[PDB]
Amino acid sequence: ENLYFQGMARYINITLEKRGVTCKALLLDDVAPRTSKAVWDALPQSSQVFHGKYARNEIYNLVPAFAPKEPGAENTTVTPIPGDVCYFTFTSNDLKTPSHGYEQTIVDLAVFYGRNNLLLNGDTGWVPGNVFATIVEGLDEMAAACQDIWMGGARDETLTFSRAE
Amino acid sequence: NLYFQGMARYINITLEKRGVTCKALLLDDVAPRTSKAVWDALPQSSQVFHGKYARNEIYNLVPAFAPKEPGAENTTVTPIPGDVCYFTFTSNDLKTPSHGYEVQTIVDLAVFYGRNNLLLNGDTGWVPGNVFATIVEGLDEMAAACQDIWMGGARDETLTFSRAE
Amino acid sequence: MARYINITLEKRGVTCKALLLDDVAPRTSKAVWDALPQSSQVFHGKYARNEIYNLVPAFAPKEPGAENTTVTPIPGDVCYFTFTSNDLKTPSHGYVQTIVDLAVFYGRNNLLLNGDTGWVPGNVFATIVEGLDEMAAACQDIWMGGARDETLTFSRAE
Amino acid sequence: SDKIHHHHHHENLYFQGMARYINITLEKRGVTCKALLLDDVAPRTSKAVWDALPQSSQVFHGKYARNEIYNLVPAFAPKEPGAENTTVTPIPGDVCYFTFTSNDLKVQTIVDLAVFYGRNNLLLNGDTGWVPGNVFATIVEGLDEMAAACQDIWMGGARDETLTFSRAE
Amino acid sequence: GMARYINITLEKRGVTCKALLLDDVAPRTSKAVWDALPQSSQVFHGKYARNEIYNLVPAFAPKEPGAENTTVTPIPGDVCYFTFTSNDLKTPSHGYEQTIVDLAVFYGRNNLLLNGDTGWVPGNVFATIVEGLDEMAAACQDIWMGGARDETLTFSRA
């Protein structure tokens, strides 16, 4: 049935390198085929982690665009739930702004570790993310590591997405 | 019981660990009940938190201190740089899975250091805050310190509101 | 038996007629009808879009509470809002007692949503059944030509 | 801290040890799922509902909240729980409690007991704006089968269909 | 040019209403649809936009009209056109049992075209129901309570 990968379920590891916490997520080859393939083909992807300021129970990284073509809207949400792993296509203009306050095409790879989140901000309104993976192992530990990023900072911390094989 | 204020009053807002203070004009004329409730009870000091949904926000949480809560007064759901806000909450509002902190009335005293903020969450929808002060000196320095809380954490950091005199 | 109200711009001399929604907004309909006429300075909405309204002191023995509410008012809607002094006397607004906002929606694609508190539902208590086009034109003229010396008056239709 | 960690762990075991469950059943289609009552985070609402079970009434599919079915019953608690563990973004498996009046839905107090069977839902309508629900249970068995039944309510209708909340043995 | 009208029909229930095609304010969408009528497919009741029924058909215009006369607050009697892709619709969040067009009828009020997939979903308002709205609304409530099995929504030239 699946558009691209038609074998047994594939999985990605999602790792905070400094804290050394990893969880594992099912790749949604069925309902997000283009986003899943774009990410999978490009793994590993690893960069400075950030805690969300508006989308709530969220951590994410920012990487240069990697796919030959961006997937476009696919399996989108503006109400991400615990365990969602999301992909966003942004431009420099979207992110390099006073409202963001950080210290080409950019991809945001995000993990939602809690509930009651809205992908909505005062820059543009709604910001839907492609849901392309779902955490199936280690979610509680990841959530605890993310609360520690919120309270204890993201200095020298790196979020890495890799193939679990 | 008008509790008239004929001259400008100011509060200092200080991050103790980082050692950064800014000064705010108290909005005695447009937020008289809130301004009094806060003024009369200063200093108020507690662990700082960075917002997860309201964006460019830091705040602390203290036990109710006023003889009676001010109610809605000079409210915003679009807080701006320099806004200092007061929120009345109950334990049920805050002690939630969606908040993920590490019946009683609790006051949130918040500082908005940047723009493009929405006081909206996935617990209840809009969460209006009473705007009761506006930062008139040291906003840039405070904004820099708050980005350092976002990136460097809030461990052992304390937000303190005090009378300037 | 259906009851109707007249809604009039005194200076422009434009009136329309509305059916009072006694069936689905009985408490609001009664509160208003019993107190008519109600007349005051007109204002054009700055956030709710195709709206004019007035502001009057509370008139009912007790406020109706939420009833037949909308945050998506449509052309022809007549709405009632209960506010306090704190709601209206703000910098955001640029104009401890209870105030009633009586509102006419003359066009579509309106949201009763503002940056002070978020959603502001109105009780929909009447629907304009005659002279909506003319009223709409007069409201556009309030938008472009101002509200100076203009009064919005609600009255019982005979 | 080690103290906090251990406390959390202890608290979780306690609530596991006294876990109670409710059955949620569509009577005509004959489909039941089981939900854990959230005595830890929604103690007031969980009690108010447990105490009054069973509760059973005509089912409705939501028209604004999306992947939702619900019933409406007269108020049953001696006092309403008030806002507790609320969401405006309900998720698959959530079971929600709302207090309404006759004016909200058409002066009587009515309870809306709701099951969310899919995702990407917003508890927001054109009458009042946001309508938060108290999340008081989470479906732990039969969610897929319940979701398939709810889709069939959506396409096939709610006629003669009853939604029943009951205590699980 | 003279007013053109369309009939909107539920084939199983046998209920038809008539709408004025909005050639003046939605000319591209009005043309796209008129030229391609009849359009007829399985009916669905909305799950998020409230008092809505609709069908889904393959794209039929030589080119899509694009945003025209849009609303996210549709009102009773609105007929709306949306352009979607299979990605917008074939989702877990939709739970249904390429360019696709959604032709929608709004039979009641207090509707928001807003969902948890993408946020706001504006529709092009291209017709307004002028006869039979009350009967259609009653049929649509009956789709809600009684289901959509073997029911077909048909748009045709009047």
Added chain:
Amino acid sequence: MARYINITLEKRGVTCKALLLDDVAPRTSKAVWDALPQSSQVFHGKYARNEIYNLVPAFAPKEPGAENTTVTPIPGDVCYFTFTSNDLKTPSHVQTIVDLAVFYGRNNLLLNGDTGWVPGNVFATIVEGLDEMAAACQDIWMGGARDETLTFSRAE
């Protein structure tokens, strides 16, 4: 070097001065600056609250696209929106039209019932005369916009 624009209501004779945000909105700032002056019939906002604006045919060789956007504009913001005739020639209220807007108060939402959120490019911030401009905008709200013209020009 900082560049400044004057924003003037011609009939009321009220002018304020705005810093052009060449750092954070370079494309929009250049597009506007290179086309000044721009001057047209003033309107008060009906949805974005504490707002006046004008509408002018597109002037730039190419539209800036999204840049430094807000849906929560604040006092002193000057915003740029690119619209088509379809966006604006509606009952609710193709050629490319630009809306140049001044926000004179707070608690504004750039959100409407036509399309939802309508982000504006923030390209200048009023640094002098805001109080006077706000009083004049309140007078447009109460006293109308007839024969009133909003003019954006280079400060000498």
